[PDB]
């Protein structure tokens, strides 16, 4: 929908979708964030490209178009190689056709970044798998080179698939994808570069986001660096602790408009956290905590009720009372406890207060002696 | 779709859907199964009821209608009690209206069994939760009594929701559901009995199936027996080992037509396992095993290839060779190994052979000396 609500009790291993990914896009101009791109400026209203955010290299003439993720960017493949290679969703195919059309007239070299999902359609229930397509066109060669970046793992000799059995089984959407790309060009104007697939090792989504950040930055120049066999040592150095906290904190604790994100990437901008986000995040915690899992559910709830109250009384033409501050001080230990704690900690860090007490201490009307 | 394919690597904790549940319906006339109903005969073409399978109590005049599960039998509820109670999907509402209409003219007492799914619509991503509606009409009282059976757990004093906070949060679809039911009757002909909800303690789906089996059988007479506070000791005695193996084996290892199921319940019938099911199950194992996780993937694959080959060569006008049997004997250890093993064991048990060797030993053309 139009907003991207805080999902408490979300974590990296709980999977990615298009909305989440688009929400993480907000991290690109955040300086506190390990995904920050200062390799780049927003583009030149110039030539935009529908469905994609445009970028000029602070170093280069090189233009970088990064597509907003889409639920319809998807490729089904048949595992059984007797069946047809598969399908691509029509929108994806459309963006391919549109890229082709963009490059047919373009002076400056470019790189197009299309996060998508690939899935087996042969399996009783298949897993949708988050991966990354990038197409790079250069005007001198008239040449497009497709490349696809994939997380899951690499070729353990046991789970190694035989050359023979490769004849009988597809593990990827590569065949249908190559077909879609060759199809997007017939001016026969473009000589197609060679299709390649890069692999590592549902955390895959997070890796994909890191890869987007990598791909863009890596156009400073050369040397595309992903975990195995080229570049980074392990996937801990690549997707790091700060990377993971950044992502989880964005998705878990914030509340973001699509408008805020599009405005944030269509010009260079950070999106500072509003107090209203803190209120919404609390509210959501509240609504969840009343079902699932010491500190009793009823205690946690009374606490969040009170804190919400104080939090938006602050927002209005008013300022809070001595007695309300008393209650809050009674509640800070419940509020700093565990998950709810990590929540209020996120928000205090971003509102610039050391504690709740510090946060609400000003805006207290004391006028009564005692 | 029209078929219910074997889902290898499915287990009880992986959740339920309507197709799976409908497939488990096949277990009701299976004698090897702990869900077998010999409390009952198929009904009397008589009055049928669309969307539901009819039943006459071998003991009674009491009629039992058990609805085929439906993806559209669903109820959304708002957790936040400031919002409206929720919605019911129109089909569900329709079946309610239709039950009401069935009872308005009915001589014999009846019980209607409607498995469905209830979910929070307020939560960023909600869990669809499998539960069970039953409505029992009696012609003397002109009275319908709704009852809903729910798995998740019961009222741990910590996670106990306060009477006050019950004011602020709904945990169930009860409000909207009661509303739908009262709505299905205005002849104001029926005096509505009191709405109740029974709870225990995504395994919930399996519990629901057991409950269906319970509810039906429990109409032998009286005493509805579910785990806590009434009836059974624990949920191990209620949903038992044989229950769980039965369900898992049905869903994991069989391949069943909707037609086979409807024919199986519209007359009293077992659905004996065909050899073709064994072939399909193997095929599916094969297609999965080429992605995910000693015995190498390539070994497992060569084995399943060979076994499939021998398995449907058997099916035709032909019978297998000495050399093929040699190969198979080489492969039985790979085939009996682990998961693939539990598969072939299921199928041998149901085809009446002690091993693969026993199974394929007849149908071998030996004509060559040596
Ligand atoms: Ba297409
Ligand atoms: Ba070529
Ligand atoms: Ba309705
Ligand atoms: Ba009443």
Residue numbers in the entry:
A (entry chain A), B (entry chain A): 48 to 248, 256 to 347, 356 to 432
The article reads:
L. pneumophila inhibits autophagy by injecting an effector protein called RavZ into the cytoplasm. RavZ functions as a cysteine protease and irreversibly deconjugates mammalian Atg8s from PE to inhibit autophagosome formation. Unlike Atg4 that cleaves the amide bond between terminal glycine and PE, RavZ cleaves the amide bond before glycine. As a consequence, the RavZ-cleaved Atg8 proteins cannot be relipidated, leading to inhibition of autophagy.
Next, we solved the structures of two RavZ fragments, 1–487 and 20–502. RavZ structures of both fragments are resolved from residues 47 to 433 and 48 to 432, respectively, whereas the missing regions at the N- and C-termini (residues 1–47 and 433–502) might be flexible and disordered. RavZ shows two major domains, the N-terminal catalytic domain (residues 49–320, catalytic triad: C258, H176, D197) and the C-terminal domain (329-423). The C-terminal domain has been recently shown to be involved in association with phosphatidylinositol 3-phsphate (PI3P) and be essential for membrane binding. Structural alignment indicated that part of the N-terminal catalytic domain of RavZ (α2–α4, β6–β9) shows a similar fold to that of the core-lipid-binding domain of Sec14, consisting of 5 β-strands and 4 α-helices (α7–α10). However, the hydrophobic pocket is closed in RavZ, suggesting that a conformational change may be required to accommodate the fatty acid chains. It should be noted that the LBS of RavZ is closed without showing a binding pocket for lipid, whereas a clear hydrophobic binding cavity that can accommodate fatty acid chains is observed in free Sec14 structures. Because the PE moiety involves interaction with residues located deep in the LBS fold, there must be a conformational change to open the lipid-binding site, for example, by outward movement of α4.
